[PDB]
Symmetry: D2
Subunit: 399 residues, 4 copies
């Protein structure tokens, strides 16, 4: 039988990563309230997740990595997000950054992972930094905000624009060690508080050429690390769809948890005005069903999209324009469905659900935040897909 | 690569049913306007569809049937509905009735198919008929409305209640020959006009016991025809999910066609008031994208659900309560999504789209009709699933 | 006490126009089915409406006109649209055209109304005609589509572009007699069938200068007829808001009728599947309530907007940019709300509601058509208002 | 008319609305510290009492204004744009006086001859345990969510008494500040500054003259009926005035959200592309649609408030149909306002969920307006639906 409401556990030999996630999930769930107040992922959470080996999901096998398929990894992030969304969001990125690093030069990867096989990077990819072309690389200055999981990373991936002969932008990534930047704690947010999305301060940071890759090169299989792992089912693919895969996975996990949490609270629900047991009233049952249907359809869309990624990576096949537009945008539609499904239940949840002692309130805020990321903006994604479907050239105003 | 916007053609070393449908589709599409005025499926349509052998999709192999999987059949109905929704709706039922008949006694099946291997049944399943218990069977009287494809069927399946010991209802089906009823032409409708959903008039019709099956028996593998086809991947399953599988397939096919038709009309769209080319304006592009996403998610949900049916039938496994509730209700949610996606485009289509000479108007009306069937009522389906998810007993008020 | 669900009848010594409409409404309602098949307003309808004097709503008092306030007239069109939407739509335009004509020269008005005080115009305002500048006027050629009520009008108002000393478009209107054009019957539509929105064929039609007005002049109180009626509470105002006021009035009336019709059908609704009396089930009651609230809010917004028009006309005050944008766009938002409210009920109405013998089907089609007019396109209206609210220059691409 | 906010009343001298507008920047600047304080700042209460808003529904004999419902509601709308919790708590401190005006002259004298500026907070859900003693009752219970309770001198408390038959008699008791403890358990994610703390009642004696039946105050049968024969506001059901502030707050949040979103949008740049994007088409259309939606919500509310005003003027108690509309229209308006807020929050970007953004506060507060028992739209849809279909009321909800 298939499962509509959550992930089917893989029927491989031994314990799958998903089962290991499920074993530690109650611990992650119990830490969620203090994680929220800590404004970063608790050390225990990172320790438990690294212990099961999730961080090595997209690390090359030569360094002791797993090279998990996208569907399998994404389902782990979904399940994790049900316990603590900020943990799942931050940890997802710590994981997906390794997929990117695997496309940099062998020398950078050796430098990161021969030293420390458990080392991860955080990131801040919006090109706000100022770049000076020196010889053998660049000097970078800037405040690099919203680096989820940055307190727990040994490196950071940082986005910047370099310039052509002509003066056209060359969007590039640089990998820098923890010692090259200061983490400034300005993370005071109303959602995914435990993600620890603090700012990275870069003062005259020298980045050597071998630690810089063009974004377009990593979209098109033209970076320094292309061809390093000829048996890989995951590295012969655009970087960005893997990088950003966790945002919608977190959204799905929140939404699936919201349904469960709402069902739990509903059973014993009484009317304050009349004293009537009201948990199983028709309007509430129909909201539960419709939100179940809506997130089941979101899950189905995501599962089909992840499978498409998996197939492309297996065949070492870079996607055409049409599938790329779907890969870019489907996840944003899924996020939009998940927020609707969460909102349909929050609207019927009563005043007690906005109290600090209610989980619903946390799920509600975190869900809305999944739709607030630049990559999940659906107005942008609708225009991207719409233009592609109509055979128009991409709008450079968005990406 | 996977396909988000329509069906992937089955990858075989032969011509699949889907490919054969695609070959005849332009003929079906060109007949759609006269089909609409005829208020029944044109003879040419039936001839073309029977010629490729689609009617034998769920007929047992012993009688020359195909025993198609549900996913493969449903995709044929989706594709067909893009050309003519009424044809797809009526023909789908002519096909799915054979799956039901395969659960009746060998004697009835022999009687239908040894005589004529190409014989089909239409139906009218709402138990409005009056039943007299005589010996060796019943006498049935009643007007049996909305029998799609009835002009083209040699038999009819008719629903009626028989009665306990206790005064309880026993919902039953009777298969009767064309000679036992009159087709009264009262089919004057505003959607799926070409379905020919005319009424069957039954005057003192004697139905012998061997041509009567209990509905519950055909839900639970307890009917006279159970175990007849031990190698079958499709008959060891509840009848109703196959019977009613075409409603949402038609809805999906209309919605996928609506997107294409809207895109075609949009390219050259000029503003009457200002004289400016407006086809590629941002609002229209975003509607196109969102309706594309919405029906892609509906397709994904349906494909997952059909796969679940296929797997259950393969294993001869009757579904548990939870999956049954999903099978019953997922299709209604998908219909609801498809109508939303159609409506999003119709709202932006302009006054010319409500003219008789526009296809959009036909797609719009036919789409809304798919949500109007008793089986696709989403209020009913939300209550059914909601109650099941909350561990409540089924509401006998609906089914 | 106030009324949320329909119009309050004006308290005046004497029978108000609204009461007179209410008296003849059952006759209009009973003619609706044959009106639909006739594809134009039945002679009896025109006769009844002219008998109560509604056509003289916006005709100057000097010619025997009423000079009704916009709110009072709009409520008559709302009530009328509950009986027959096509009649209300066509007749509304026959009425509002007189407001426009009142801004042309005294000579044209004398020519129309001294001859025949009961004479009306239809229109086709999209500037598709080809214009030759001759002396003393123009020669116009073109097919002028969608002229609602044209079979019953003695004149037509026709839109065309003239050109500047410098080649800039001068959007203009010409009033021509019935003898100058052929009505071509190409009116085959799926909504407001009884509007008789046939095409006007113009072959080398000479229009003298005194029968031509600039649109901008009639927006800004600069046309030949400005200042003719110094005591008027209605003529010192932009022409367009009155011209186009009937589209949303018709939408409101359809929506208010749909609620009533749905309530009537619901009372006795039995389940075909089970036999239970289901008319008063919770989901249906909530749809009834929400559609009641939604159209009450639409009515409230329209009433406030009509009052704003009434006040401006009373004071002879031409609206500023902000109020003009609201006048232009509020009606389109109201139409959008009314269609949502109709759709919420149609979705729960069952298969019998799509039969030709059901009124719901007619209300459903006609409602959607109200959202299909160029003036009620909400994508256009959202951009118009949005740009104004943000202090941006108007987009010439729309109007 | 004005579509986007209230028209200021044209009177000689200053209207209450103008006075609200004068103090609004002070209320707005206090909103962040009000949020952290988890109650209305003393300065806010002082400013609002100084302009005399608390005396809106107090009888004229005690120095009250007897404001019309529309005029009062528009003051709460405007106030909610600056601080939603302040508006929400203060609205209730104001509307309670309308209720108190239906109690006995003796209770009113006792409250207002003593202190003309005295107000009540409330907790109306009948969770308390009642002992019938003689000359009144003894009440025990935890009475949660009493907005503005730190600033009130009295509390109105809801409880069930019983019939000869054992039937529920839903009643209200007015008790002094000295008879209860304010327990600070107010830790919420919206309207934080409302200070909706709990009232602890331990063996509180309430004398009969301080108890009124809810139904009596719905039907003009309470002890205070007929006390103010010239009043344009007291010959009316209590509950529609009591609960009028919830939707007023929702409207004010929504109208502010539009303004705040417009302000942030002007200079908006894409992080990934560095393009000025504030005036892009999708954002303009969201601004317009949210403007239309809250304009229609305002129009519906204004019409409903006018209907209340007219009924009160004529001393006319509403029939069943208008009562159902009065009960439910405000909940539909709240639902529209939240949609309008959500349409803008969905396009607002990640910076809008930071603590230093106002949008985040408006978003949370808006959703909370839809979370009150009186604004539950599922309940309201059933109430209206049943009435429209000629069915008897469902006792399961009210």
């Amino acid at each position: 039988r298939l499962v509509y409401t959550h992930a089917q556990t893989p029927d491989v030999s031994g314990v799958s990563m998903l089962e290991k996630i499920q074993q530690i999930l109650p611990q992650i769930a119990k830490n969620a309230e203090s994680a929220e107040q800590l404004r970063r992922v608790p050390d225990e959470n990172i320790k438990l997740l690294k212990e099961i080996g999730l961080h090595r999901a997209f690390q090359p096998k030569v360094y002791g990595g797993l090279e998990m398929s996208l569907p399998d990894f994404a389902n782990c992030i979904v399940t994790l997000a049900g316990a603590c969304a900020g943990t799942a969001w931050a940890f997802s990125l710590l994981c997906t950054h390794s997929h990117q690093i695997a496309m940099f030069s062998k020398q950078l990867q050796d430098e990161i992972w021969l030293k420390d096989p458990d080392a991860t990077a955080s990131s801040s990819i919006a090109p706000f930094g100022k770049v000076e072309e020196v010889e053998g690389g660049i000097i970078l200055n800037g405040d690099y905000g919203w680096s989820s999981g940055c307190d727990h990373a040994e490196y950071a991936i940082v986005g910047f624009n370099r310039f052509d002969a002509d003066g056209n932008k060359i969007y590039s990534f640089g990998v820098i060690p923890r010692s090259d930047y200061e983490i400034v704690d300005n993370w005071y947010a109303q959602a995914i508080k435990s993600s620890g999305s603090k700012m990275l301060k870069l003062v005259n940071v020298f980045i050597p050429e071998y630690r810089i890759s063009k974004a377009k090169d990593m979209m098109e299989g033209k970076s320094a690390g292309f061809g390093l792992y000829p048996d890989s089912k995951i590295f012969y693919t655009p970087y960005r769809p893997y990088f950003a895969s966790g945002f919608s996975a977190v959204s799905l996990g929140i939404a699936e948890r919201m349904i469960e949490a709402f069902k739990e609270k509903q059973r014993n629900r009484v009317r304050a005005y009349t004293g009537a047991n009201v948990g199983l009233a028709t309007p509430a049952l129909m909201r539960i069903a419709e939100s179940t249907h809506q997130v089941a359809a979101a899950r189905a869309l995501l599962e089909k999209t992840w499978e498409d990624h998996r197939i492309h990576g297996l065949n070492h096949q870079y996607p055409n324009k049409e599938t790329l537009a779907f890969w870019r945008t489907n996840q944003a539609y899924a996020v939009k469905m998940c927020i609707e499904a969460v909102d349909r239940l929050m609207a019927a949840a009563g005043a007690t659900s906005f109290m600090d002692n209610s989980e619903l309130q946390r799920l509600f805020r975190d869900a809305h935040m999944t739709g607030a990321h630049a990559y999940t903006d659906y107005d942008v994604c609708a225009q991207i897909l719409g233009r592609e479907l109509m055979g128009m050239e991409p709008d450079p105003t968005m990406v």
